[PDB]
Amino acid sequence: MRHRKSGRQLNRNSSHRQAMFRNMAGSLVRHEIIKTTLPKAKELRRVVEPLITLAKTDSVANRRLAFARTRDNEIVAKLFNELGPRFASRAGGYTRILKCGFRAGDNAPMAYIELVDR
């Protein structure tokens, strides 16, 4: 049974999941479009979209709290100086997933995840 449970496990233990989405979240903020497997792009939306509503209100307390979840001051600065104001009026849904072909090496289904006003 798995009833009413949420969260992809992605064939990794918990600490390797926690650290892998922390890298992707930094990479999407910095490049504004990346290419991933479709299961890992749908699980990214629940990590990087809460980071953007956090950045909509600048304070020392929130910056120190976006830092505990990205561990990258070059990412925290972009969130609070560009992606905060840019999505100021949008209420949720800062990200768009687009399916593309299949990865050659192992036939994984691919997708492009980006920020909406890229």
Partner: protein
Amino acid sequence: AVQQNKPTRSKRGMRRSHDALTAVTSLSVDKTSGEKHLRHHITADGYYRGRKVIAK
């Protein structure tokens, strides 16, 4: 465990009656580009439903 008699070439082909692949029924045609693609997938140069989503 292992077989006691050699299974024939009819029992082999009956088992493989479910092994066939299914072709894609149709390919959608892009609104502006006019090129085929899988439905719900971007085309081969980044058009999806008219607009150009991947300017690469």
